DNA sequence: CGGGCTTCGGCCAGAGGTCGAGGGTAATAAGAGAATTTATACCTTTATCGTCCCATAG
C-alpha cells in the first residue's frame, strides 16, 4: 500500500530475519560444532566428515 | 434373507542400556495522561506496662 514516493527501498526491507537465520544456522545447527584441535589430523578428519 | 458372529484390516500408544566426560545455547518495544490506590510521613490520643511510694500483716 505504500507509495513509490512515500517509501524508499532502504526503508522497506528489514534485514533482521536473514541475519537471525544465518546466526542460528552458524551457531546452533547440529552440523555446526567446535573443531577438534587436539591433533592436526583431527582437524582434517573433522572437515572431511 | 436379515442377523448374530467371527475375523481381519486400518489406526494409535508405548517402549526401546548404563555410567561417565567435555563443549555450547538458551527469549523483546505506544505515548499521553487520567485516575485510583497505596505506601509514607507527621501528629495527636488512648492504653499499657515498667516503676516506685506507702500502709500493713506477721
Coordinates of N, CA, C and O (backbone and C1' of nucleotides) in Angstrom, one line a residue:
Chain A
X1 N 0.8 -1.2 0.0 CA 0.0 0.0 0.0 C 0.8 1.3 0.0 O 0.3 2.3 -0.3
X2 N 2.1 1.2 0.3 CA 3.0 2.3 0.3 C 3.3 2.8 -1.1 O 3.3 2.1 -2.1
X3 N 3.5 4.1 -1.2 CA 3.7 4.8 -2.5 C 5.2 4.7 -2.8 O 6.1 4.6 -2.0
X4 N 5.5 4.8 -4.1 CA 6.9 4.9 -4.6 C 7.6 6.1 -4.0 O 8.7 6.0 -3.7
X5 N 6.9 7.2 -4.0 CA 7.4 8.4 -3.4 C 7.4 8.3 -1.9 O 8.3 8.9 -1.2
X6 N 6.4 7.7 -1.3 CA 6.2 7.6 0.1 C 7.3 6.7 0.8 O 7.5 6.9 2.0
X7 N 7.8 5.7 0.1 CA 8.7 4.8 0.6 C 9.9 4.6 -0.3 O 9.8 4.6 -1.5
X8 N 11.1 4.4 0.3 CA 12.4 4.2 -0.3 C 12.8 2.7 -0.2 O 12.4 2.1 0.8
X9 N 13.6 2.2 -1.1 CA 13.9 0.8 -1.0 C 14.7 0.4 0.3 O 14.5 -0.7 0.8
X10 N 15.5 1.3 0.8 CA 16.3 1.1 2.0 C 15.3 1.0 3.2 O 15.7 0.3 4.2
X11 N 14.2 1.7 3.2 CA 13.3 1.7 4.3 C 12.2 0.6 4.3 O 11.5 0.4 5.2
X12 N 12.2 -0.2 3.2 CA 11.1 -1.2 3.1 C 11.6 -2.6 3.6 O 10.9 -3.3 4.3
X13 N 12.9 -3.0 3.2 CA 13.4 -4.3 3.5 C 13.9 -4.3 5.0 O 14.7 -3.4 5.4
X14 N 13.5 -5.2 5.7 CA 14.0 -5.5 7.1 C 15.0 -6.7 7.0 O 14.5 -7.8 6.7
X15 N 16.2 -6.4 7.4 CA 17.3 -7.5 7.2 C 17.4 -8.3 8.5 O 18.3 -9.2 8.5
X16 N 16.6 -8.1 9.5 CA 16.8 -8.8 10.8 C 16.5 -10.3 10.6 O 17.3 -11.1 11.1
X17 N 15.4 -10.8 9.9 CA 15.2 -12.2 9.8 C 16.4 -13.0 9.2 O 16.7 -14.1 9.6
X18 N 17.0 -12.4 8.1 CA 18.1 -13.1 7.4 C 19.3 -13.2 8.3 O 20.0 -14.3 8.4
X19 N 19.6 -12.2 9.0 CA 20.7 -12.2 10.0 C 20.5 -13.2 11.1 O 21.4 -13.9 11.5
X20 N 19.3 -13.2 11.6 CA 18.9 -14.2 12.7 C 19.0 -15.6 12.2 O 19.6 -16.5 12.9
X21 N 18.5 -15.9 10.9 CA 18.6 -17.2 10.4 C 20.1 -17.6 10.2 O 20.4 -18.8 10.5
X22 N 20.9 -16.7 9.6 CA 22.3 -17.1 9.4 C 23.0 -17.3 10.7 O 23.8 -18.3 10.8
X23 N 22.8 -16.5 11.7 CA 23.4 -16.7 13.0 C 22.9 -18.0 13.6 O 23.8 -18.7 14.2
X24 N 21.6 -18.3 13.5 CA 21.1 -19.5 14.1 C 21.7 -20.8 13.5 O 22.2 -21.7 14.1
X25 N 21.8 -20.8 12.1 CA 22.5 -21.9 11.4 C 23.9 -22.0 11.8 O 24.4 -23.1 12.0
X26 N 24.6 -20.9 11.9 CA 26.1 -20.9 12.1 C 26.5 -21.2 13.5 O 27.6 -21.5 13.8
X27 N 25.5 -21.0 14.5 CA 25.9 -21.2 15.9 C 25.2 -22.3 16.6 O 25.7 -22.8 17.6
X28 N 24.0 -22.7 16.2 CA 23.2 -23.7 16.9 C 22.7 -24.8 16.1 O 21.9 -25.7 16.6
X29 N 23.1 -24.9 14.8 CA 22.7 -26.1 14.0 C 23.5 -27.3 14.5 O 24.5 -27.2 15.1
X30 N 22.9 -28.5 14.2 CA 23.5 -29.7 14.6 C 24.9 -29.9 13.9 O 25.8 -30.4 14.5
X31 N 24.9 -29.6 12.6 CA 26.1 -29.7 11.9 C 27.2 -28.7 12.2 O 28.3 -28.8 11.7
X32 N 26.8 -27.6 12.9 CA 27.8 -26.7 13.3 C 28.4 -27.1 14.7 O 27.6 -27.1 15.7
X33 N 29.7 -27.3 14.8 CA 30.3 -27.8 16.0 C 31.7 -27.4 16.1 O 32.4 -27.2 15.1
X34 N 32.2 -27.4 17.4 CA 33.6 -26.9 17.6 C 34.6 -27.9 17.0 O 34.4 -29.1 17.1
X35 N 35.6 -27.3 16.3 CA 36.6 -28.2 15.7 C 37.4 -28.9 16.7 O 37.7 -28.4 17.8
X36 N 37.8 -30.2 16.4 CA 38.7 -31.0 17.2 C 40.1 -30.6 16.9 O 40.7 -30.9 15.9
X37 N 40.7 -29.8 17.8 CA 42.0 -29.2 17.6 C 43.1 -29.9 18.5 O 44.2 -29.3 18.6
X38 N 42.8 -31.1 19.1 CA 43.9 -31.7 19.8 C 45.0 -32.3 18.8 O 46.1 -32.5 19.2
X39 N 44.6 -32.5 17.6 CA 45.5 -33.0 16.6 C 45.4 -32.2 15.3 O 44.2 -31.8 15.0
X40 N 46.4 -32.0 14.5 CA 46.2 -31.5 13.2 C 45.5 -32.5 12.3 O 44.8 -32.1 11.4
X41 N 45.6 -33.8 12.6 CA 44.9 -34.8 11.9 C 43.4 -34.8 12.3 O 42.5 -35.1 11.5
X42 N 43.1 -34.4 13.5 CA 41.7 -34.3 14.0 C 41.0 -33.2 13.2 O 39.8 -33.4 12.8
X43 N 41.6 -32.1 12.9 CA 41.0 -31.1 12.1 C 40.7 -31.6 10.7 O 39.6 -31.4 10.1
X44 N 41.7 -32.3 10.1 CA 41.5 -32.8 8.7 C 40.4 -33.8 8.6 O 39.5 -33.7 7.8
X45 N 40.3 -34.7 9.6 CA 39.3 -35.7 9.6 C 37.9 -35.1 10.1 O 36.9 -35.8 9.8
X46 N 37.9 -34.0 10.7 CA 36.6 -33.3 11.0 C 36.1 -32.6 9.8 O 34.9 -32.6 9.6
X47 N 36.9 -31.9 9.1 CA 36.5 -31.2 7.9 C 36.1 -32.1 6.7 O 35.3 -31.7 5.9
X48 N 36.7 -33.3 6.7 CA 36.3 -34.3 5.7 C 35.3 -35.3 6.1 O 35.3 -36.4 5.7
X49 N 34.4 -34.8 7.0 CA 33.4 -35.7 7.7 C 32.1 -35.6 7.0 O 31.5 -34.5 7.0
Chain B
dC1 P -34.3 -63.3 -1.0 O5' -34.1 -63.0 0.6 C5' -35.1 -62.4 1.3 C4' -34.6 -62.1 2.7 C3' -33.5 -61.1 2.8 O3' -33.6 -60.2 3.9 C1' -32.8 -63.1 3.8
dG2 P -33.0 -58.7 3.8 O5' -32.7 -58.4 5.4 C5' -33.7 -58.1 6.3 C4' -33.5 -58.7 7.6 C3' -32.4 -58.1 8.5 O3' -32.7 -58.4 9.9 C1' -31.7 -60.2 7.9
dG3 P -32.1 -57.5 11.0 O5' -32.0 -58.6 12.2 C5' -32.0 -60.0 12.0 C4' -30.8 -60.6 12.6 C3' -29.7 -59.7 13.1 O3' -29.2 -60.2 14.4 C1' -28.7 -61.2 11.6
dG4 P -28.4 -59.2 15.4 O5' -27.4 -60.1 16.1 C5' -27.8 -61.1 17.1 C4' -27.1 -62.4 16.9 C3' -25.7 -62.4 17.5 O3' -25.3 -63.7 17.9 C1' -25.5 -62.7 15.1
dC5 P -24.0 -64.1 18.7 O5' -23.4 -65.3 17.9 C5' -23.3 -65.3 16.5 C4' -21.9 -65.3 16.0 C3' -20.9 -64.7 16.9 O3' -19.7 -65.4 16.8 C1' -20.8 -63.6 14.9
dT6 P -18.5 -65.3 17.9 O5' -17.2 -65.8 17.1 C5' -17.3 -66.8 16.1 C4' -16.5 -66.5 14.9 C3' -15.1 -66.1 15.1 O3' -14.2 -66.8 14.3 C1' -16.1 -64.4 13.8
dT7 P -12.6 -66.8 14.5 O5' -12.0 -65.8 13.4 C5' -12.5 -65.9 12.1 C4' -12.1 -64.7 11.2 C3' -10.7 -64.1 11.6 O3' -10.1 -63.8 10.4 C1' -12.3 -62.4 11.7
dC8 P -8.5 -63.5 10.4 O5' -8.3 -62.8 8.9 C5' -9.4 -62.3 8.2 C4' -9.3 -60.8 8.0 C3' -7.9 -60.2 8.2 O3' -7.7 -59.2 7.3 C1' -9.5 -59.1 9.6
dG9 P -6.2 -58.6 7.0 O5' -6.4 -57.5 5.9 C5' -7.7 -56.9 5.7 C4' -7.8 -55.5 6.2 C3' -6.4 -54.8 6.4 O3' -6.5 -53.5 5.9 C1' -7.7 -54.7 8.4
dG10 P -5.2 -52.6 5.6 O5' -5.4 -51.2 6.3 C5' -6.6 -50.5 6.0 C4' -7.0 -49.5 7.1 C3' -5.8 -48.6 7.5 O3' -6.3 -47.3 7.8 C1' -6.6 -49.8 9.4
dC11 P -5.2 -46.1 8.0 O5' -5.3 -45.9 9.6 C5' -6.6 -45.6 10.2 C4' -6.4 -45.4 11.7 C3' -5.1 -44.6 12.1 O3' -5.3 -43.7 13.2 C1' -5.2 -46.7 13.2
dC12 P -4.3 -42.5 13.4 O5' -3.9 -42.7 15.0 C5' -4.9 -42.7 16.0 C4' -4.4 -43.3 17.3 C3' -3.0 -42.8 17.8 O3' -3.0 -42.6 19.2 C1' -3.0 -45.2 17.6
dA13 P -1.9 -41.7 19.9 O5' -1.6 -42.5 21.2 C5' -2.3 -43.7 21.4 C4' -1.7 -44.5 22.6 C3' -0.4 -43.9 23.2 O3' -0.1 -44.3 24.5 C1' 0.1 -45.9 22.0
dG14 P 0.8 -43.5 25.5 O5' 2.0 -44.5 25.8 C5' 1.7 -45.8 26.1 C4' 3.0 -46.7 26.0 C3' 4.3 -45.9 26.1 O3' 5.2 -46.5 27.0 C1' 4.3 -47.2 24.1
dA15 P 6.2 -45.6 27.8 O5' 7.4 -46.6 28.2 C5' 7.3 -48.0 27.8 C4' 8.4 -48.5 27.0 C3' 9.4 -47.4 26.6 O3' 10.3 -47.0 27.6 C1' 8.9 -48.8 24.7
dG16 P 11.7 -47.8 27.9 O5' 12.6 -47.3 26.7 C5' 14.0 -47.8 26.6 C4' 14.2 -48.8 25.5 C3' 15.2 -48.3 24.4 O3' 16.5 -48.7 24.8 C1' 13.2 -49.0 23.4
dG17 P 17.5 -47.6 25.6 O5' 17.7 -48.3 27.0 C5' 18.1 -49.6 27.1 C4' 19.0 -49.7 28.3 C3' 19.6 -48.4 28.8 O3' 18.8 -47.9 29.9 C1' 21.4 -49.9 28.4
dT18 P 19.0 -46.4 30.4 O5' 20.3 -46.5 31.3 C5' 20.5 -47.4 32.4 C4' 21.9 -47.4 32.8 C3' 22.5 -46.1 33.0 O3' 22.2 -45.6 34.3 C1' 24.0 -47.6 31.9
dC19 P 22.3 -44.0 34.5 O5' 23.9 -43.7 34.8 C5' 24.6 -44.4 35.8 C4' 26.1 -44.4 35.5 C3' 26.7 -43.1 35.2 O3' 26.9 -42.4 36.4 C1' 27.5 -44.7 33.7
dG20 P 27.1 -40.8 36.4 O5' 27.4 -40.4 34.9 C5' 28.2 -39.4 34.5 C4' 29.7 -39.8 34.5 C3' 30.6 -38.9 33.8 O3' 31.3 -38.1 34.7 C1' 30.6 -41.1 32.8
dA21 P 30.9 -36.6 34.9 O5' 32.0 -35.8 34.0 C5' 33.3 -36.4 33.9 C4' 33.8 -36.3 32.5 C3' 33.4 -35.0 31.8 O3' 34.3 -34.0 32.2 C1' 33.2 -36.9 30.4
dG22 P 33.6 -32.6 32.8 O5' 33.7 -31.6 31.6 C5' 35.0 -31.3 31.0 C4' 34.9 -31.4 29.5 C3' 34.1 -30.3 28.9 O3' 34.8 -29.1 28.8 C1' 33.6 -32.4 27.8
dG23 P 34.2 -27.8 29.4 O5' 33.6 -27.0 28.1 C5' 34.4 -26.9 26.9 C4' 33.6 -27.1 25.7 C3' 32.4 -26.1 25.5 O3' 32.9 -24.9 25.0 C1' 31.8 -28.3 24.9
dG24 P 32.4 -23.5 25.5 O5' 31.0 -23.3 24.7 C5' 31.0 -23.5 23.3 C4' 29.6 -23.6 22.8 C3' 28.7 -22.5 23.3 O3' 28.2 -21.8 22.2 C1' 27.6 -24.7 23.5
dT25 P 27.6 -20.3 22.4 O5' 26.1 -20.5 22.4 C5' 25.4 -21.3 21.4 C4' 23.9 -21.4 21.7 C3' 23.4 -20.2 22.4 O3' 22.1 -19.8 21.9 C1' 22.9 -22.2 23.6
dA26 P 21.8 -18.3 21.5 O5' 20.6 -17.9 22.5 C5' 20.6 -18.3 23.8 C4' 19.5 -19.4 24.0 C3' 18.3 -19.0 24.9 O3' 17.2 -19.5 24.3 C1' 19.5 -20.9 25.8
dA27 P 16.2 -18.6 23.4 O5' 16.6 -17.1 23.8 C5' 16.6 -16.1 22.9 C4' 15.3 -15.4 22.8 C3' 15.3 -13.9 23.3 O3' 14.3 -13.2 22.6 C1' 14.0 -15.3 24.7
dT28 P 14.5 -11.6 22.5 O5' 13.6 -11.2 21.2 C5' 13.6 -9.8 20.8 C4' 12.2 -9.2 21.2 C3' 12.1 -7.8 20.8 O3' 10.8 -7.6 20.1 C1' 11.6 -8.0 23.1
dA29 P 10.6 -6.4 19.1 O5' 9.6 -5.4 19.8 C5' 9.5 -4.0 19.4 C4' 8.6 -3.2 20.3 C3' 8.6 -1.7 20.0 O3' 7.2 -1.3 20.0 C1' 9.2 -2.1 22.3
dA30 P 6.8 0.2 20.5 O5' 5.4 0.4 19.9 C5' 4.4 1.0 20.6 C4' 4.6 2.5 20.8 C3' 5.2 2.9 22.2 O3' 5.8 4.2 22.1 C1' 2.9 3.4 22.2
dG31 P 6.7 4.7 23.3 O5' 6.1 6.2 23.6 C5' 6.1 7.2 22.7 C4' 5.0 8.2 23.0 C3' 5.1 8.9 24.3 O3' 4.8 10.3 24.1 C1' 3.0 7.8 24.1
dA32 P 4.7 11.3 25.4 O5' 3.1 11.3 25.7 C5' 2.2 11.6 24.7 C4' 0.8 11.9 25.3 C3' 0.8 12.6 26.6 O3' -0.2 13.5 26.7 C1' -0.3 10.6 26.8
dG33 P -0.3 14.7 27.8 O5' -1.8 14.8 28.2 C5' -2.6 13.6 27.9 C4' -3.1 13.0 29.2 C3' -2.5 13.6 30.5 O3' -3.4 13.8 31.5 C1' -2.3 11.3 30.5
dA34 P -4.7 14.8 31.4 O5' -5.9 13.9 31.4 C5' -5.8 12.4 31.5 C4' -6.9 11.8 32.2 C3' -7.3 12.5 33.6 O3' -8.6 12.1 33.9 C1' -6.1 10.4 33.9
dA35 P -9.2 12.4 35.4 O5' -8.9 11.0 36.1 C5' -9.3 9.8 35.4 C4' -9.1 8.6 36.3 C3' -9.4 8.8 37.8 O3' -10.0 7.7 38.4 C1' -7.2 8.0 37.5
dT36 P -10.9 7.8 39.7 O5' -10.5 6.5 40.6 C5' -10.2 5.3 39.9 C4' -9.1 4.5 40.7 C3' -9.3 4.6 42.2 O3' -9.1 3.4 42.8 C1' -7.1 5.2 41.5
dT37 P -9.7 3.1 44.3 O5' -8.5 2.3 45.0 C5' -7.8 1.3 44.3 C4' -6.3 1.3 44.6 C3' -6.0 1.3 46.1 O3' -5.0 0.3 46.4 C1' -4.8 3.0 45.2
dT38 P -4.8 -0.3 47.8 O5' -3.2 -0.8 47.8 C5' -2.4 -0.3 46.7 C4' -1.2 0.4 47.3 C3' -1.0 0.3 48.8 O3' 0.3 0.2 49.2 C1' -1.1 2.5 48.3
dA39 P 0.9 -1.0 50.1 O5' 2.3 -0.5 50.6 C5' 3.3 -0.1 49.6 C4' 3.9 1.2 50.0 C3' 4.5 1.4 51.4 O3' 5.8 2.0 51.3 C1' 2.9 3.1 51.0
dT40 P 6.5 2.4 52.7 O5' 6.2 3.9 52.9 C5' 6.5 4.9 51.8 C4' 6.4 6.3 52.3 C3' 6.9 6.5 53.7 O3' 7.6 7.8 53.8 C1' 4.7 7.2 53.6
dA41 P 8.6 8.2 55.0 O5' 8.8 9.7 54.9 C5' 7.7 10.6 54.4 C4' 6.9 11.2 55.5 C3' 7.5 11.1 56.9 O3' 8.0 12.3 57.3 C1' 5.1 10.8 56.8
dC42 P 8.3 12.6 58.9 O5' 7.0 13.2 59.4 C5' 6.3 14.3 58.7 C4' 5.3 15.0 59.6 C3' 5.6 15.1 61.1 O3' 5.2 16.3 61.6 C1' 3.6 13.8 60.8
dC43 P 5.3 16.7 63.1 O5' 3.8 16.2 63.7 C5' 2.7 16.7 63.0 C4' 1.4 16.4 63.8 C3' 1.6 16.3 65.3 O3' 0.6 16.9 65.9 C1' 0.7 14.3 64.5
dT44 P 0.7 17.3 67.5 O5' -0.6 16.7 68.2 C5' -1.9 17.0 67.6 C4' -2.9 15.9 67.9 C3' -3.0 15.6 69.4 O3' -4.4 15.4 69.7 C1' -2.5 13.6 68.3
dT45 P -5.0 15.4 71.2 O5' -6.0 14.2 71.2 C5' -5.8 13.1 70.4 C4' -6.5 11.9 71.0 C3' -6.6 11.8 72.5 O3' -7.6 10.9 72.8 C1' -5.0 10.3 71.8
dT46 P -8.2 10.9 74.3 O5' -8.0 9.4 74.8 C5' -8.6 8.3 74.0 C4' -7.9 7.0 74.2 C3' -7.7 6.6 75.7 O3' -8.2 5.3 75.9 C1' -5.6 6.4 74.4
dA47 P -8.2 4.6 77.3 O5' -7.0 3.5 77.1 C5' -7.1 2.5 76.1 C4' -5.8 1.7 76.0 C3' -5.6 0.8 77.2 O3' -4.9 -0.3 76.8 C1' -3.8 2.4 77.0
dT48 P -4.9 -1.6 77.8 O5' -3.4 -2.2 77.6 C5' -2.5 -1.6 76.6 C4' -1.1 -1.7 77.0 C3' -0.8 -2.5 78.3 O3' 0.4 -3.1 78.3 C1' 0.0 -0.3 78.6
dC49 P 0.7 -4.5 79.1 O5' 2.2 -4.8 78.9 C5' 3.0 -3.8 78.2 C4' 3.8 -3.0 79.2 C3' 4.2 -3.8 80.5 O3' 5.6 -3.6 80.7 C1' 3.3 -1.7 81.0
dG50 P 6.4 -4.7 81.7 O5' 7.7 -3.9 82.1 C5' 8.4 -3.1 81.2 C4' 8.8 -1.8 81.9 C3' 9.5 -1.9 83.2 O3' 10.5 -0.9 83.3 C1' 7.6 -0.6 83.5
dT51 P 11.5 -0.9 84.5 O5' 11.3 0.5 85.3 C5' 10.0 1.1 85.3 C4' 9.8 1.9 86.6 C3' 10.3 1.2 87.8 O3' 11.1 2.2 88.6 C1' 8.1 1.8 88.1
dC52 P 12.0 1.8 89.8 O5' 11.3 2.5 91.1 C5' 11.1 3.9 91.0 C4' 10.0 4.4 91.9 C3' 10.3 4.1 93.4 O3' 9.9 5.2 94.2 C1' 8.2 3.2 92.8
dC53 P 10.5 5.4 95.7 O5' 9.2 5.9 96.5 C5' 8.5 7.1 96.1 C4' 7.2 7.2 96.8 C3' 7.2 7.1 98.3 O3' 6.2 7.9 98.8 C1' 5.9 5.3 97.4
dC54 P 6.0 8.1 100.4 O5' 4.9 7.0 100.8 C5' 3.7 6.9 100.0 C4' 2.8 5.9 100.7 C3' 3.0 5.8 102.2 O3' 1.7 5.7 102.9 C1' 3.2 3.6 101.2
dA55 P 1.7 5.8 104.5 O5' 0.7 4.6 104.9 C5' -0.5 4.4 104.3 C4' -1.0 3.0 104.4 C3' -1.2 2.5 105.9 O3' -2.4 1.7 106.0 C1' 0.3 1.1 104.7
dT56 P -2.8 1.1 107.4 O5' -2.4 -0.4 107.3 C5' -2.7 -1.2 106.1 C4' -2.0 -2.5 106.2 C3' -2.0 -3.2 107.6 O3' -2.1 -4.6 107.5 C1' 0.2 -3.0 106.8
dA57 P -3.5 -5.3 107.9 O5' -3.0 -6.9 107.9 C5' -2.5 -7.5 106.7 C4' -1.5 -8.5 107.0 C3' -1.8 -9.3 108.3 O3' -1.4 -10.7 108.1 C1' 0.3 -8.2 108.5
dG58 P -1.6 -11.8 109.3 O5' -0.2 -12.1 109.8 C5' 0.8 -12.6 108.9 C4' 2.2 -12.6 109.5 C3' 2.3 -13.2 110.9 O3' 3.4 -14.1 111.0 C1' 3.2 -11.1 111.0

